[PDB]
Design an enzyme around this catalytic site. Structure first.
Site, short mmCIF file in Angstrom:
data_model
loop_
_atom_site.label_atom_id
_atom_site.label_comp_id
_atom_site.label_asym_id
_atom_site.label_seq_id
_atom_site.Cartn_x
_atom_site.Cartn_y
_atom_site.Cartn_z
N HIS A 137 0.84 -1.23 0.00
CA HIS A 137 0.00 0.00 0.00
C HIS A 137 0.87 1.26 0.00
CE1 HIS A 137 -0.01 -0.37 4.57
NE2 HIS A 137 0.16 0.95 4.44
N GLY A 150 2.33 6.12 10.25
CA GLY A 150 3.79 6.02 10.09
C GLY A 150 4.33 4.70 10.58
N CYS A 167 3.19 1.71 9.81
CA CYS A 167 3.04 0.64 8.78
C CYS A 167 4.44 0.16 8.37
CB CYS A 167 2.15 1.09 7.62
SG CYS A 167 0.44 1.10 8.13
C1 LIG Z 1 -0.30 2.62 7.67
O1 LIG Z 1 -0.58 2.39 6.32
C2 LIG Z 1 0.71 3.73 7.86
O2 LIG Z 1 1.29 3.82 8.92
N1 LIG Z 1 1.05 4.42 6.77
C3 LIG Z 1 1.67 5.73 6.84
C4 LIG Z 1 2.07 6.28 5.48
C5 LIG Z 1 0.85 7.04 5.00
C6 LIG Z 1 0.20 7.59 6.24
C7 LIG Z 1 0.73 6.78 7.43
C8 LIG Z 1 -1.55 2.74 8.53
C9 LIG Z 1 -1.28 2.38 10.00
C10 LIG Z 1 -2.51 2.66 10.84
C11 LIG Z 1 -2.94 4.11 10.86
C12 LIG Z 1 -3.44 4.35 12.28
N2 LIG Z 1 -2.76 3.32 13.04
C13 LIG Z 1 -2.39 2.28 12.31
O3 LIG Z 1 -2.04 1.18 12.75
N3 LIG Z 1 -2.57 1.84 7.97
C14 LIG Z 1 -3.71 2.34 7.46
O4 LIG Z 1 -4.03 3.52 7.56
C15 LIG Z 1 -4.60 1.34 6.73
C16 LIG Z 1 -4.52 1.48 5.21
C17 LIG Z 1 -3.69 0.44 4.46
C18 LIG Z 1 -4.60 -0.76 4.29
C19 LIG Z 1 -6.02 -0.32 4.61
C20 LIG Z 1 -5.95 1.21 4.73
C21 LIG Z 1 -6.82 1.80 5.82
N4 LIG Z 1 -6.01 1.61 7.03
C22 LIG Z 1 -6.42 1.66 8.31
O5 LIG Z 1 -5.63 1.40 9.23
C23 LIG Z 1 -7.86 2.05 8.59
N5 LIG Z 1 -8.67 0.86 8.78
C24 LIG Z 1 -9.61 0.48 7.92
O6 LIG Z 1 -9.87 1.08 6.90
C25 LIG Z 1 -10.41 -0.78 8.26
F1 LIG Z 1 -11.63 -0.49 8.70
F2 LIG Z 1 -9.82 -1.48 9.22
F3 LIG Z 1 -10.55 -1.59 7.22
C26 LIG Z 1 -7.95 3.01 9.78
C27 LIG Z 1 -9.36 3.57 9.96
C28 LIG Z 1 -9.47 4.51 11.15
C29 LIG Z 1 -8.12 4.77 11.81
C30 LIG Z 1 -7.07 5.17 10.78
C31 LIG Z 1 -6.95 4.16 9.65
#
Ligand SMILES: *[C@](O)(C(=O)NC1CCCC1)[C@H](C[C@@H]1CCNC1=O)NC(=O)[C@@H]1[C@H]2CCC[C@H]2CN1C(=O)[C@@H](NC(=O)C(F)(F)F)C1CCCCC1
Ligand SMILES: *[C@](O)(C(=O)NC1CCCC1)[C@H](C[C@@H]1CCNC1=O)NC(=O)[C@@H]1[C@H]2CCC[C@H]2CN1C(=O)[C@@H](NC(=O)C(F)(F)F)C1CCCCC1
Lengths: 301, 301
Positions: B41, B143, B145
């Site tokens: 991703h 961040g 991930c």
């Molecule tokens: C992760 O990709 C990351 O750290 N990436 C960084 C570079 C770009 C911005 C940050 C991130 C890690 C999570 C964010 C909050 N805490 C975490 O553990 N992952 C995601 O945001 C992840 C992406 C990648 C695959 C799916 C999408 C959506 N997502 C989520 O974590 C969301 N969850 C969902 O959509 C679902 F319902 F579980 F399916 C979260 C929803 C609310 C909280 C923030 C993101």
């Protein structure tokens, strides 16, 4: 996003851990530049430990009485001196993995990471609080002596603890890296007791803010209180008094959540008076006091 | 001697953590030999993530679309391929700090250490359990991930987790290092739900043995029980069934303490039926299920 008892990454400290042997006694040392720091009781036999005179015990030793092993390589000792309860062993090689470091003496209520070590080999890492009675609730078996506690700010390792002993209540006691014990403990196998402990109030409040930032709100209420009326309840539940310095430190967390400190104090009061009624906060059925305000900000970014 | 949620020393893994940037997306990768592993991703924009076709998104990328930073040095990408939900970036330098390692897929009920990372910089280390519903109760912000989970046996790092996402209950989901998700989760911003979680019974029993080994004995009783009658009460309290395989694994702890497994089962039954009545075990007011029998033996040496 969650809240965990989190230790500092331990790599910078792993690369400093060595084994120190004197006769039949083997424990852990910390190798920084051309110096290895360890508990002075390394020079002791079982018999000496009952009432050692360390100055006598040490004047009877030479450099060659000390085997220092960094993994496989033996470091040649070229000097020794005692500083309080630590032995300093001058060695012929500066540690190429010496990080930026300081020796710091921490205050009660502050937290640090411990790298449990056996035979100079890192075994595990975990987070501790210096209790108000200057003990730590560690996990330490025979061979752990010389294991260190540390904080990492930027790339600088601040060493604050070296492990020496276990008290009969199953808690632990040791020194800063200048060899001065935390609390009224001595490196002698004699009856000694942990003084009565108190709960670190500012850390409980910090953990309540952590709870709110992660979506636990059940324990909140409309009430507030005064430092004075709060501290009357703290007295009653064996909690440290809260100061303006404590309220000031909770400021950034107070702002971020929009819950006033004395508002969050009114929440702690009701939790202290009625308990939690089968509910939990951040997966605990107890009020947690081993997170500082800094730990909560750091982790909840 | 004490009992703590203990993480593996993180040094061997710190030396593998890098930053991977693709356009405006920055996250963490794992650099082993001449390969960097990260969440696929990374190639996504906010918009793509609502419903990506990764095959498409990746065919539109070149080696030069990927900036890989190991601290201050930039690594040149010379190849890329996707394996399930992980991207593999072939780089022109083998990591000189590559430890002995394996990729392992862990079972529910097993534990591992997580090295929380932001911008390729290690931030903290903590211990996690793969929950029966294939989530972990982590601490991860934006961040995080690409942050990995691992066990260390002798000097070999077994990597078992890479972080990808947070579910609405505030628990976390990701993959093994071959990119296969644990549980029925997908890397798409769509409504997804943690299934109902159960308590890991064998780990609660292991923790009770840890308790006895550290002198907490209050919860013991004269009674025993049978696997069947115990499993009837487990069913009722949302506890995983116990097997002969579980009884057999608890053997070394059963022997060391002289409390039979089915004897310790009668203790758990009474704790489930009547609660703890204001008492604690190893400083918890809850029954703890994130220690394996191996964790208890390892720590209680
Ligand atoms: C992760 O990709 C990351 O750290 N990436 C960084 C570079 C770009 C911005 C940050 C991130 C890690 C999570 C964010 C909050 N805490 C975490 O553990 N992952 C995601 O945001 C992840 C992406 C990648 C695959 C799916 C999408 C959506 N997502 C989520 O974590 C969301 N969850 C969902 O959509 C679902 F319902 F579980 F399916 C979260 C929803 C609310 C909280 C923030 C993101
Ligand atoms: C530490 O010296 C060690 O790891 N040494 C190894 C090399 C030689 C043998 C093992 C050891 C660490 C503790 C052992 C159990 N858990 C620990 O954290 N410390 C001690 O044994 C320490 C020595 C050195 C200064 C005083 C003496 C006695 N001592 C104790 O920990 C004992 N405590 C006390 O005597 C006192 F009451 F607290 F003062 C313990 C008494 C009960 C049995 C275990 C030791």
């Amino acid at each position: 996003s969650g809240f965990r008892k989190m230790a500092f990454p331990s790599g910078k400290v792993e690369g400093c851990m060595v084994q120190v042997t004197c006769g039949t006694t083997t424990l852990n040392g910390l190798w920084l530049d051309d110096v290895v720091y360890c508990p002075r009781h390394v020079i002791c036999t079982s018999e000496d430990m009952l009432n050692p005179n360390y100055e006598d015990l040490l004047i009877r030793k030479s450099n060659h009485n000390f085997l220092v092993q960094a993994g496989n390589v033996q470091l040649r000792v070229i000097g020794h001196s005692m500083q309080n309860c630590v032995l300093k062993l001058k060695v012929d090689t500066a540690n190429p993995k010496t990080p930026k470091y300081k020796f710091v003496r921490i205050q009660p209520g502050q937290t640090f990471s411990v790298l449990a070590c056996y035979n100079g080999s890192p075994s595990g890492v975990y987070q501790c609080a210096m209790r108000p009675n200057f003990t730590i609730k560690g996990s330490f078996l025979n061979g752990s002596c010389g294991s260190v506690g540390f904080n990492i700010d930027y790339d600088c390792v601040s060493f604050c603890y070296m492990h020496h002993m276990e008290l009969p209540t199953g808690v632990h006691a040791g020194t800063d890296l200048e060899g001065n014990f935390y609390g009224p403990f001595v490196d002698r196998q004699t009856a000694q007791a942990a003084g009565t402990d108190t709960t670190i109030t500012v850390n409980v409040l910090a953990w309540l803010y952590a709870a709110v930032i992660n979506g636990d709100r059940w324990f909140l209420n409309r009430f507030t209180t005064t430092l004075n009326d709060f501290n009357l309840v703290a007295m009653k539940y064996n909690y440290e008094p809260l100061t303006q310095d404590h309220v000031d430190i909770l400021g950034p967390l107070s702002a971020q959540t929009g819950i006033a400190v004395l508002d969050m104090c009114a929440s702690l009061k009701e939790l202290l008076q009625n308990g939690m009624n089968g509910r939990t906060i951040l997966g605990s059925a107890l009020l947690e006091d081993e997170f500082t305000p800094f730990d909560v900000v750091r982790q909840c970014s």
